[PDB]
Coordinates of C-alpha atoms in Angstrom, one line a residue:
Chain J
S1 CA 0.0 0.0 0.0
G2 CA 0.8 3.7 0.0
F3 CA 0.5 6.2 -2.9
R4 CA 3.2 8.4 -4.3
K5 CA 3.7 10.9 -7.1
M6 CA 5.8 8.4 -9.1
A7 CA 7.9 9.2 -12.2
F8 CA 8.8 6.8 -14.9
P9 CA 12.3 5.3 -14.6
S10 CA 14.6 7.6 -16.7
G11 CA 17.4 5.3 -17.8
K12 CA 16.2 4.9 -21.4
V13 CA 16.0 8.7 -21.8
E14 CA 19.3 9.5 -20.0
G15 CA 21.2 7.8 -22.8
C16 CA 19.6 10.1 -25.3
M17 CA 20.5 13.6 -23.9
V18 CA 23.2 15.6 -25.6
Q19 CA 24.5 19.1 -25.3
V20 CA 24.0 21.4 -28.3
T21 CA 25.9 24.7 -28.8
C22 CA 25.5 27.3 -31.4
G23 CA 27.6 30.4 -30.9
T24 CA 27.3 31.3 -27.2
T25 CA 24.0 29.5 -26.5
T26 CA 24.1 26.0 -25.0
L27 CA 21.0 23.9 -24.3
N28 CA 20.0 20.2 -24.4
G29 CA 19.2 18.0 -27.4
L30 CA 17.6 14.6 -27.8
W31 CA 19.7 12.2 -29.9
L32 CA 17.6 9.4 -31.5
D33 CA 18.9 7.3 -34.4
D34 CA 21.2 9.8 -36.3
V35 CA 19.1 12.9 -35.6
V36 CA 19.4 15.5 -32.8
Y37 CA 16.3 17.4 -31.9
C38 CA 16.6 20.7 -30.0
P39 CA 14.7 24.0 -29.6
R40 CA 15.3 26.3 -32.6
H41 CA 16.1 29.3 -30.3
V42 CA 19.6 27.7 -29.8
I43 CA 20.5 30.0 -32.8
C44 CA 19.4 33.1 -30.8
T45 CA 21.3 35.5 -28.6
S46 CA 19.5 36.9 -25.5
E47 CA 18.9 40.1 -27.6
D48 CA 17.5 38.1 -30.5
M49 CA 14.9 36.6 -28.2
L50 CA 12.9 39.9 -28.0
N51 CA 11.9 39.7 -31.7
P52 CA 13.5 36.8 -33.5
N53 CA 13.2 36.2 -37.2
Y54 CA 14.2 32.5 -37.2
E55 CA 14.4 32.1 -41.0
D56 CA 16.7 35.1 -41.3
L57 CA 18.9 34.0 -38.3
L58 CA 19.1 30.4 -39.7
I59 CA 20.5 31.7 -43.1
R60 CA 23.7 32.7 -41.3
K61 CA 24.3 29.2 -39.9
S62 CA 26.1 26.2 -41.5
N63 CA 26.4 22.6 -40.3
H64 CA 29.8 23.4 -38.7
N65 CA 28.3 26.2 -36.5
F66 CA 26.4 23.5 -34.4
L67 CA 28.5 21.7 -31.8
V68 CA 26.9 18.5 -30.5
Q69 CA 28.6 16.8 -27.6
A70 CA 27.6 13.5 -26.0
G71 CA 29.6 13.2 -22.8
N72 CA 32.9 13.8 -24.5
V73 CA 31.9 12.0 -27.7
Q74 CA 31.7 14.7 -30.3
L75 CA 29.1 14.3 -33.1
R76 CA 29.6 15.6 -36.6
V77 CA 26.6 17.6 -38.0
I78 CA 26.0 16.8 -41.6
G79 CA 22.6 18.4 -42.2
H80 CA 20.2 20.7 -40.5
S81 CA 16.6 21.6 -41.0
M82 CA 14.0 23.6 -39.1
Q83 CA 10.6 21.9 -38.5
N84 CA 8.2 24.3 -36.8
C85 CA 9.9 25.3 -33.6
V86 CA 12.5 22.5 -33.4
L87 CA 15.9 22.1 -35.2
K88 CA 16.6 18.6 -36.6
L89 CA 20.4 18.2 -36.8
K90 CA 21.5 15.2 -38.8
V91 CA 24.7 13.7 -37.3
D92 CA 27.1 11.1 -38.7
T93 CA 26.6 8.6 -35.9
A94 CA 23.4 6.8 -34.9
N95 CA 22.8 6.7 -31.1
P96 CA 23.7 3.1 -30.0
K97 CA 21.5 3.7 -27.0
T98 CA 18.4 4.6 -29.0
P99 CA 15.3 3.0 -27.4
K100 CA 12.2 1.9 -29.1
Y101 CA 10.4 5.2 -29.3
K102 CA 7.4 7.2 -30.6
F103 CA 6.4 10.8 -30.8
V104 CA 3.0 11.6 -29.4
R105 CA 1.1 14.8 -29.0
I106 CA -0.7 14.7 -25.7
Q107 CA -4.0 16.2 -24.5
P108 CA -4.5 18.5 -21.5
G109 CA -4.9 16.5 -18.4
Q110 CA -2.5 13.9 -19.4
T111 CA 0.6 13.3 -17.2
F112 CA 4.2 12.6 -18.1
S113 CA 7.7 12.5 -16.6
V114 CA 10.2 15.3 -17.2
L115 CA 13.9 14.6 -17.1
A116 CA 15.4 18.0 -16.2
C117 CA 18.8 18.4 -17.8
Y118 CA 21.6 21.0 -17.9
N119 CA 24.5 20.9 -20.4
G120 CA 23.2 17.5 -21.6
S121 CA 23.4 16.0 -18.2
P122 CA 20.4 14.8 -16.1
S123 CA 19.6 16.7 -12.9
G124 CA 16.4 15.1 -11.8
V125 CA 13.1 13.5 -12.8
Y126 CA 9.6 14.5 -11.8
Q127 CA 6.0 13.8 -12.8
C128 CA 3.6 16.5 -13.9
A129 CA 0.4 17.2 -15.9
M130 CA -0.3 19.2 -18.9
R131 CA -2.6 21.9 -17.6
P132 CA -5.9 22.7 -19.4
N133 CA -4.4 26.1 -20.4
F134 CA -1.5 24.2 -22.1
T135 CA 1.2 25.2 -19.6
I136 CA 3.0 22.9 -17.2
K137 CA 4.0 23.8 -13.6
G138 CA 7.6 22.7 -13.9
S139 CA 11.0 23.2 -12.1
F140 CA 13.3 24.6 -14.7
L141 CA 16.3 27.0 -14.5
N142 CA 18.3 28.8 -17.2
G143 CA 19.9 26.2 -19.5
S144 CA 17.1 23.6 -19.1
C145 CA 15.7 24.2 -22.6
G146 CA 15.5 21.0 -24.6
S147 CA 14.7 18.9 -21.6
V148 CA 12.0 16.4 -22.6
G149 CA 8.8 14.9 -21.1
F150 CA 8.0 11.3 -21.8
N151 CA 5.9 8.2 -20.9
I152 CA 6.8 4.5 -21.2
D153 CA 4.8 1.6 -22.5
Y154 CA 6.7 -1.6 -21.6
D155 CA 9.7 -1.2 -23.9
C156 CA 8.7 1.9 -25.9
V157 CA 9.4 5.5 -24.9
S158 CA 6.7 8.0 -26.0
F159 CA 8.2 11.5 -26.2
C160 CA 5.5 14.1 -25.7
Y161 CA 7.2 17.4 -24.6
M162 CA 10.3 19.5 -25.1
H163 CA 10.9 22.5 -22.9
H164 CA 11.2 25.9 -24.6
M165 CA 10.1 28.8 -22.4
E166 CA 9.3 30.2 -19.0
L167 CA 6.5 32.7 -19.1
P168 CA 6.7 35.9 -17.1
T169 CA 4.3 34.3 -14.6
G170 CA 6.7 31.5 -13.8
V171 CA 4.9 28.7 -15.6
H172 CA 6.4 26.7 -18.5
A173 CA 5.6 26.2 -22.2
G174 CA 7.0 24.0 -24.9
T175 CA 6.3 21.9 -27.9
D176 CA 5.7 18.3 -29.0
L177 CA 8.7 16.6 -30.8
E178 CA 7.4 17.8 -34.2
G179 CA 8.0 21.4 -33.0
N180 CA 4.4 22.5 -32.5
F181 CA 3.7 24.4 -29.3
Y182 CA 1.1 23.2 -26.9
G183 CA -1.3 26.1 -26.7
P184 CA -1.0 29.6 -28.3
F185 CA 2.5 30.3 -27.2
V186 CA 5.4 31.4 -29.4
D187 CA 9.2 31.2 -28.9
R188 CA 9.7 34.9 -28.3
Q189 CA 10.4 36.8 -25.1
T190 CA 7.2 38.8 -24.9
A191 CA 4.2 39.1 -22.6
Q192 CA 2.0 36.1 -23.2
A193 CA -0.9 35.4 -20.9
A194 CA -2.2 31.9 -20.2
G195 CA -5.9 31.3 -19.7
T196 CA -7.6 30.0 -16.6
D197 CA -5.9 27.1 -15.0
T198 CA -8.9 24.8 -14.3
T199 CA -8.8 21.7 -12.2
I200 CA -8.7 18.3 -14.0
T201 CA -11.9 16.8 -12.6
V202 CA -11.4 13.2 -14.0
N203 CA -8.0 13.1 -12.4
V204 CA -9.3 14.3 -9.0
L205 CA -11.9 11.4 -9.2
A206 CA -9.2 8.9 -10.0
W207 CA -7.1 10.0 -7.0
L208 CA -10.2 9.8 -4.7
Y209 CA -10.5 6.2 -5.9
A210 CA -6.8 5.7 -5.0
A211 CA -7.6 7.1 -1.6
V212 CA -10.4 4.5 -1.0
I213 CA -8.2 1.7 -2.2
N214 CA -5.6 2.8 0.3
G215 CA -8.0 3.1 3.3
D216 CA -8.8 6.9 3.3
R217 CA -12.6 6.7 3.2
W218 CA -13.7 9.5 5.6
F219 CA -15.0 11.7 2.7
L220 CA -17.4 9.1 1.4
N221 CA -20.9 10.5 2.0
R222 CA -24.5 9.4 1.8
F223 CA -25.5 11.3 -1.4
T224 CA -25.5 10.7 -5.1
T225 CA -25.9 13.2 -8.0
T226 CA -26.3 13.5 -11.7
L227 CA -23.7 14.5 -14.4
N228 CA -25.6 17.8 -15.0
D229 CA -26.0 18.7 -11.4
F230 CA -22.3 17.9 -10.6
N231 CA -21.1 19.9 -13.6
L232 CA -23.2 22.9 -12.5
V233 CA -21.2 22.9 -9.3
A234 CA -17.8 22.0 -10.8
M235 CA -17.8 24.9 -13.3
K236 CA -18.5 27.3 -10.4
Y237 CA -15.2 26.1 -8.8
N238 CA -13.2 26.3 -12.0
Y239 CA -13.3 22.5 -12.4
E240 CA -13.3 20.9 -15.8
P241 CA -16.7 19.5 -16.8
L242 CA -17.1 15.7 -16.7
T243 CA -18.3 13.9 -19.8
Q244 CA -19.5 10.4 -20.5
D245 CA -16.1 9.5 -21.9
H246 CA -14.6 10.3 -18.5
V247 CA -17.2 8.1 -16.7
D248 CA -16.2 5.3 -19.0
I249 CA -12.5 5.7 -18.3
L250 CA -13.2 5.4 -14.6
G251 CA -15.2 2.2 -14.9
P252 CA -12.4 -0.2 -13.8
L253 CA -11.9 1.8 -10.6
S254 CA -15.6 1.8 -9.8
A255 CA -15.7 -1.9 -10.4
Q256 CA -12.7 -2.6 -8.1
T257 CA -14.0 -0.4 -5.2
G258 CA -17.7 -0.9 -5.6
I259 CA -18.4 2.8 -5.6
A260 CA -20.3 4.2 -8.6
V261 CA -18.7 7.1 -10.5
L262 CA -21.7 9.3 -9.8
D263 CA -21.6 8.5 -6.0
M264 CA -17.9 9.5 -6.0
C265 CA -19.0 12.8 -7.8
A266 CA -21.4 13.5 -5.0
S267 CA -18.6 13.0 -2.5
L268 CA -16.4 15.4 -4.5
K269 CA -19.3 17.9 -4.7
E270 CA -19.5 18.1 -0.9
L271 CA -15.7 18.5 -0.7
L272 CA -15.8 21.5 -3.0
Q273 CA -18.7 23.2 -1.1
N274 CA -17.6 22.4 2.5
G275 CA -13.8 22.0 2.1
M276 CA -11.8 19.4 3.9
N277 CA -12.1 21.0 7.3
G278 CA -8.5 20.5 8.3
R279 CA -8.4 16.8 7.3
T280 CA -6.2 15.3 4.7
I281 CA -6.6 12.7 1.9
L282 CA -3.6 10.5 1.0
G283 CA -1.4 13.0 3.0
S284 CA -2.7 16.1 1.0
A285 CA -4.8 19.0 2.2
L286 CA -5.8 19.9 -1.4
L287 CA -7.5 17.9 -4.0
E288 CA -4.8 16.5 -6.3
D289 CA -5.3 16.4 -10.0
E290 CA -1.9 15.1 -11.4
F291 CA -2.9 11.4 -11.4
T292 CA -4.8 10.1 -14.5
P293 CA -7.1 7.1 -14.1
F294 CA -4.4 5.0 -15.9
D295 CA -1.7 6.3 -13.5
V296 CA -3.8 5.1 -10.5
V297 CA -4.4 1.6 -12.0
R298 CA -0.7 1.3 -13.0
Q299 CA 0.5 2.3 -9.5
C300 CA -2.0 0.2 -7.6
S301 CA -1.3 -2.9 -9.9
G302 CA 2.5 -2.8 -10.0
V303 CA 3.0 -2.4 -13.8
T304 CA 6.7 -2.7 -14.8
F305 CA 8.7 -1.7 -17.9
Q306 CA 11.7 -2.8 -19.9
Chain S
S1 CA 11.8 28.9 -11.5
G2 CA 9.3 26.5 -9.9
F3 CA 9.8 23.8 -7.3
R4 CA 9.1 20.1 -7.6
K5 CA 9.5 16.9 -5.5
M6 CA 12.3 15.7 -7.8
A7 CA 13.9 12.2 -7.7
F8 CA 17.4 11.4 -8.8
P9 CA 17.8 10.0 -12.4
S10 CA 17.5 6.2 -12.0
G11 CA 19.5 4.9 -15.0
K12 CA 22.6 3.9 -13.0
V13 CA 20.4 1.8 -10.6
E14 CA 18.1 0.3 -13.2
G15 CA 21.1 -1.6 -14.6
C16 CA 21.7 -3.2 -11.2
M17 CA 18.3 -4.7 -10.5
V18 CA 17.8 -8.5 -10.8
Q19 CA 15.2 -11.0 -9.9
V20 CA 16.0 -13.5 -7.1
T21 CA 14.0 -16.7 -6.6
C22 CA 14.3 -19.3 -3.9
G23 CA 11.6 -22.0 -3.9
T24 CA 8.3 -20.2 -4.6
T25 CA 9.3 -16.7 -3.3
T26 CA 10.5 -14.1 -5.8
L27 CA 11.8 -10.6 -5.0
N28 CA 14.3 -8.1 -6.2
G29 CA 18.1 -8.1 -5.8
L30 CA 20.9 -5.6 -6.3
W31 CA 23.7 -6.8 -8.5
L32 CA 27.0 -5.0 -7.9
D33 CA 30.4 -6.4 -9.0
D34 CA 29.9 -10.2 -8.5
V35 CA 27.6 -10.0 -5.5
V36 CA 23.8 -10.0 -5.4
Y37 CA 22.2 -8.4 -2.3
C38 CA 18.6 -9.3 -1.4
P39 CA 16.3 -9.5 1.7
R40 CA 17.0 -12.7 3.6
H41 CA 13.3 -13.5 3.8
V42 CA 13.5 -14.7 0.2
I43 CA 14.1 -18.1 1.9
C44 CA 10.8 -17.9 3.7
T45 CA 7.3 -19.1 2.8
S46 CA 4.3 -17.0 3.8
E47 CA 3.9 -19.4 6.7
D48 CA 7.5 -19.1 7.8
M49 CA 7.1 -15.3 8.1
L50 CA 5.0 -15.5 11.3
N51 CA 8.0 -16.9 13.3
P52 CA 11.1 -17.5 11.1
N53 CA 14.3 -19.0 12.4
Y54 CA 16.6 -17.8 9.6
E55 CA 19.7 -19.8 10.6
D56 CA 17.6 -23.0 10.6
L57 CA 15.9 -22.2 7.3
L58 CA 19.2 -21.3 5.7
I59 CA 20.7 -24.7 6.6
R60 CA 18.4 -26.3 4.1
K61 CA 19.5 -24.2 1.2
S62 CA 22.4 -24.7 -1.2
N63 CA 23.8 -22.4 -3.9
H64 CA 21.7 -24.0 -6.6
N65 CA 18.5 -23.3 -4.7
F66 CA 18.9 -19.6 -5.5
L67 CA 17.9 -18.6 -9.1
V68 CA 19.2 -15.2 -10.1
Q69 CA 17.9 -13.7 -13.4
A70 CA 19.0 -10.5 -15.1
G71 CA 16.6 -9.9 -17.9
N72 CA 17.0 -13.3 -19.4
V73 CA 20.7 -13.5 -18.5
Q74 CA 20.9 -16.2 -15.9
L75 CA 23.6 -15.9 -13.2
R76 CA 25.3 -18.8 -11.5
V77 CA 25.4 -18.6 -7.7
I78 CA 28.7 -19.9 -6.4
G79 CA 28.5 -18.8 -2.7
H80 CA 26.0 -17.4 -0.3
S81 CA 26.2 -15.8 3.2
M82 CA 23.8 -14.1 5.5
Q83 CA 24.9 -10.7 6.8
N84 CA 22.4 -9.4 9.4
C85 CA 19.1 -9.2 7.5
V86 CA 20.5 -9.4 3.9
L87 CA 21.7 -12.4 1.8
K88 CA 24.9 -11.9 -0.2
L89 CA 24.9 -14.2 -3.2
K90 CA 28.2 -14.6 -4.9
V91 CA 27.7 -15.0 -8.6
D92 CA 30.2 -16.0 -11.4
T93 CA 29.7 -12.8 -13.4
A94 CA 30.5 -9.3 -12.4
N95 CA 27.8 -6.8 -13.4
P96 CA 29.2 -4.9 -16.5
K97 CA 26.9 -2.0 -15.6
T98 CA 28.2 -1.6 -12.0
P99 CA 28.4 2.1 -11.3
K100 CA 30.8 3.8 -8.9
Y101 CA 29.0 3.2 -5.6
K102 CA 29.1 3.4 -1.8
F103 CA 26.9 2.0 1.0
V104 CA 25.8 4.6 3.5
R105 CA 23.6 4.5 6.6
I106 CA 21.4 7.6 6.6
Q107 CA 20.0 9.6 9.5
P108 CA 16.3 10.4 10.1
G109 CA 15.3 13.4 8.1
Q110 CA 17.5 12.6 5.2
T111 CA 15.9 12.1 1.7
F112 CA 16.6 9.6 -1.0
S113 CA 15.0 8.3 -4.2
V114 CA 13.4 4.8 -4.3
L115 CA 13.3 2.8 -7.5
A116 CA 10.2 0.6 -7.0
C117 CA 10.7 -2.8 -8.8
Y118 CA 8.8 -6.0 -9.4
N119 CA 10.4 -9.2 -10.7
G120 CA 13.6 -7.3 -11.1
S121 CA 12.0 -4.7 -13.4
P122 CA 11.7 -1.0 -12.6
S123 CA 8.1 0.3 -12.1
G124 CA 8.7 3.9 -11.0
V125 CA 10.9 6.3 -9.1
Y126 CA 9.9 8.7 -6.3
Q127 CA 11.6 10.8 -3.6
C128 CA 10.9 10.3 0.1
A129 CA 12.3 11.0 3.6
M130 CA 13.4 8.7 6.4
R131 CA 10.9 9.6 9.1
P132 CA 12.1 10.4 12.6
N133 CA 10.5 7.1 13.8
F134 CA 12.6 5.2 11.2
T135 CA 9.8 4.3 8.8
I136 CA 9.3 5.6 5.3
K137 CA 5.9 6.5 3.7
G138 CA 6.4 4.6 0.5
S139 CA 4.4 3.1 -2.3
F140 CA 5.1 -0.7 -2.3
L141 CA 3.0 -3.7 -3.4
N142 CA 3.6 -7.4 -2.9
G143 CA 6.8 -8.4 -4.7
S144 CA 8.5 -5.0 -4.1
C145 CA 10.9 -6.3 -1.4
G146 CA 14.5 -5.7 -2.4
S147 CA 13.8 -2.4 -4.1
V148 CA 16.4 0.1 -3.1
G149 CA 16.7 3.7 -2.0
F150 CA 19.7 5.8 -3.2
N151 CA 21.3 9.2 -3.7
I152 CA 23.8 10.3 -6.3
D153 CA 27.0 12.4 -5.9
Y154 CA 28.2 13.4 -9.4
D155 CA 29.2 9.9 -10.7
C156 CA 28.8 7.9 -7.4
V157 CA 25.6 6.1 -6.3
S158 CA 25.1 6.0 -2.5
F159 CA 22.8 3.1 -1.7
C160 CA 21.1 3.7 1.7
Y161 CA 17.9 1.6 1.8
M162 CA 16.6 -1.8 0.9
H163 CA 12.8 -2.5 1.3
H164 CA 11.9 -5.4 3.5
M165 CA 8.4 -5.0 5.2
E166 CA 5.1 -3.3 5.3
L167 CA 3.9 -2.7 8.8
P168 CA 0.2 -3.4 9.7
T169 CA -0.3 0.4 9.8
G170 CA 0.7 0.7 6.1
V171 CA 4.1 2.3 6.5
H172 CA 7.3 0.7 5.4
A173 CA 10.5 -0.5 7.0
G174 CA 13.8 -1.8 5.8
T175 CA 17.6 -2.0 6.2
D176 CA 20.8 -0.4 5.0
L177 CA 22.8 -2.4 2.6
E178 CA 24.7 -4.1 5.4
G179 CA 21.5 -5.7 6.5
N180 CA 20.8 -3.6 9.6
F181 CA 17.3 -2.4 10.0
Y182 CA 16.5 1.3 10.4
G183 CA 14.8 1.5 13.8
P184 CA 13.7 -1.3 16.1
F185 CA 11.9 -3.4 13.5
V186 CA 12.5 -7.1 12.7
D187 CA 11.8 -9.2 9.6
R188 CA 8.9 -11.1 11.1
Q189 CA 5.2 -10.8 10.4
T190 CA 4.1 -9.6 13.8
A191 CA 2.6 -6.5 15.3
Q192 CA 5.3 -3.8 15.6
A193 CA 4.3 -0.3 16.5
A194 CA 6.2 2.7 15.3
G195 CA 6.8 5.7 17.5
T196 CA 5.5 9.2 17.0
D197 CA 6.0 10.5 13.4
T198 CA 7.3 14.0 14.2
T199 CA 7.8 16.7 11.6
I200 CA 11.3 17.4 10.4
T201 CA 11.7 21.0 11.3
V202 CA 15.0 21.8 9.5
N203 CA 13.4 20.5 6.3
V204 CA 10.3 22.7 6.7
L205 CA 12.6 25.7 7.1
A206 CA 14.5 24.8 4.0
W207 CA 11.3 24.5 2.0
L208 CA 10.1 27.9 3.3
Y209 CA 13.4 29.3 2.0
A210 CA 12.7 27.7 -1.4
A211 CA 9.3 29.4 -1.3
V212 CA 10.9 32.8 -0.8
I213 CA 13.4 32.1 -3.6
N214 CA 10.4 31.3 -5.9
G215 CA 8.3 34.3 -5.0
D216 CA 5.9 32.9 -2.3
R217 CA 6.5 35.5 0.5
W218 CA 3.1 36.1 2.1
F219 CA 3.9 34.2 5.2
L220 CA 6.9 36.4 6.1
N221 CA 6.0 38.2 9.2
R222 CA 7.3 41.1 11.4
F223 CA 8.5 39.0 14.3
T224 CA 11.7 37.2 15.4
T225 CA 12.3 34.6 18.1
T226 CA 14.9 32.6 19.9
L227 CA 15.9 29.0 19.6
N228 CA 14.5 28.2 23.0
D229 CA 11.2 30.0 22.5
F230 CA 10.7 28.4 19.1
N231 CA 11.5 24.9 20.3
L232 CA 9.0 25.3 23.1
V233 CA 6.3 25.9 20.5
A234 CA 7.6 23.3 18.0
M235 CA 7.6 20.4 20.6
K236 CA 3.9 21.2 21.3
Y237 CA 3.1 20.6 17.7
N238 CA 5.2 17.3 17.4
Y239 CA 7.9 19.1 15.5
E240 CA 11.5 18.1 15.9
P241 CA 13.6 20.5 18.0
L242 CA 16.0 22.7 16.1
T243 CA 19.7 22.7 17.1
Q244 CA 22.7 25.0 16.4
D245 CA 23.9 22.4 13.8
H246 CA 20.6 22.9 11.9
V247 CA 21.1 26.7 12.0
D248 CA 24.5 26.2 10.5
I249 CA 23.2 23.9 7.7
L250 CA 20.7 26.6 6.7
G251 CA 23.4 29.4 6.5
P252 CA 23.7 29.4 2.7
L253 CA 19.9 29.8 2.3
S254 CA 19.8 32.7 4.8
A255 CA 22.7 34.4 3.0
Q256 CA 21.1 34.0 -0.5
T257 CA 17.7 35.4 0.7
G258 CA 18.7 37.9 3.3
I259 CA 16.4 36.3 5.9
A260 CA 17.9 35.2 9.2
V261 CA 17.2 31.7 10.3
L262 CA 15.6 32.9 13.5
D263 CA 13.4 35.3 11.6
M264 CA 12.2 32.4 9.4
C265 CA 11.6 30.4 12.7
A266 CA 9.3 33.2 13.9
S267 CA 7.4 33.0 10.6
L268 CA 7.0 29.2 11.0
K269 CA 5.9 29.7 14.6
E270 CA 3.0 31.8 13.5
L271 CA 2.1 29.3 10.8
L272 CA 1.9 26.5 13.4
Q273 CA -0.3 28.6 15.8
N274 CA -2.5 30.3 13.2
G275 CA -2.5 27.8 10.3
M276 CA -2.4 28.8 6.7
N277 CA -6.0 30.1 6.6
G278 CA -6.8 28.6 3.2
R279 CA -3.6 29.9 1.5
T280 CA -0.9 27.7 -0.1
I281 CA 2.9 27.7 -0.1
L282 CA 4.6 26.4 -3.3
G283 CA 1.2 24.8 -4.2
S284 CA 0.8 23.0 -0.9
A285 CA -1.7 23.5 1.9
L286 CA 0.5 21.7 4.4
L287 CA 4.0 22.4 5.6
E288 CA 6.2 20.1 3.6
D289 CA 9.2 18.3 5.3
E290 CA 10.6 16.0 2.5
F291 CA 13.2 18.5 1.2
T292 CA 16.6 18.8 3.0
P293 CA 18.5 22.1 2.9
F294 CA 20.9 20.3 0.4
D295 CA 17.9 19.3 -1.8
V296 CA 16.8 22.9 -2.0
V297 CA 20.2 24.2 -2.9
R298 CA 20.7 21.5 -5.5
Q299 CA 17.3 22.1 -7.2
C300 CA 17.6 25.9 -7.1
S301 CA 21.2 25.7 -8.5
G302 CA 20.8 23.1 -11.2
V303 CA 23.3 20.5 -10.1
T304 CA 23.8 17.6 -12.5
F305 CA 25.2 14.1 -12.3
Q306 CA 27.1 11.6 -14.5

């Protein structure tokens, strides 16, 4: 028993991180097969970032202006191309440590692990969720650009995030591995406001199921509700509305615990209206929304990977 | 910016996990050089665990009764010995993936990363603290015994924990890598009560410094205090007393932020007496005590490892 905010094991990704330098800018790259992926603003100076014209900046760069370093291994760049907001650097050596991998574009509410890196070297690993306003609440310092987010399915790594920017508000924005930003953000140092950061209701429900499985049952009440009545309350508290698709995804947790999804919704509804009154749930005094239903099943079942 | 409960990157440890089977019991082992370390209760059946006589059970085992499997690689056991509560199995092959490593026995309040494994395969990684009553609040299912806790110093892995037991209360107990339990626990299925789980005061203070560094300053008040006056209040709230050694360890955070340790203590004192009144600190509604002063410095400075 017990329940923890657990990250994926990072070994498969550690072997893919490299350092990319162009001029005086150094950040992280992802080395898979014979391609290195990195944020295109590696070609920018700090002054360029206020108003960069990436096509015009890229004209002044040749293959030999990109220095790619793996440990001390030095990779030769033999081709480069810009795909949306990422640079693809073709190198002369395929990564011998390339895992089975896939590129996926995730949806808000989904979770992944981030391997925070500096100068191509791993610093730590943590789990986070893509917020409904397409930011993540990360832990990133200067030099962390190019760090990646990922999930694992048995032996296959799914890369879903590459870090590009810290907004003036202190939250983080980035792209998928095809270079497309999540959300409306651009790789320019300018005021960009995120929308409302709503709570991911289906994840809260999954975590309440985890609590019940682990013996925290005090919040279970005597009421039930309907989807429309719950959603009326949720939207007042900046909670995401629940759909029938979400009820379906929660089915296996309802079956294991014997608590119907709508009964759990009525328990949540009373928690939103009355608060937790100084009590905790799974060691937290707030409702946690960074566990998906799949995360809960995985952790409570002991799924392993290659 | 931002602040996360960050684990160490796990790749160096992943390459050391193996599966150990004896009879019908299977758990995890740690393969370093030509030795495999695992919990000695691998030699027990579920019935033996109520009252095991390990010396007498061990008499009935030979080298060939231990099956050690690394992926599909099958290791030959050529010697075995019991050291306190761990079995050391000598195998015929040195682990080619052995990192630079050390065995350390940690003190309560120190933090480490746990690589939770099942059947020798990694399931996830998370950060936790050794509680002052020598338990950890883990996430472990049946089969997780032999999973290890570790820290990293540049290129050296410090192994500090091996998981052995879940207490009837749902908290977790285990040994250092020399087989000595943390705390008064024994590897027998019997009622064992832990002592009071007090809050690790020096860690709370470190995390409040992290909050200030990251812009959460609302709790800073106008008061100061003394060590004796603070400790009088702390002990009433089941907080660990603060010593001069703890003040010294916090010196670099006080220097960076300009806030004296005793001033931060007065801020904490008012938080204990008045609560947080529905506000949060670094996204938490409780005072967090699983970051050491070194963790905070490391995360706020971007330290990396091999």
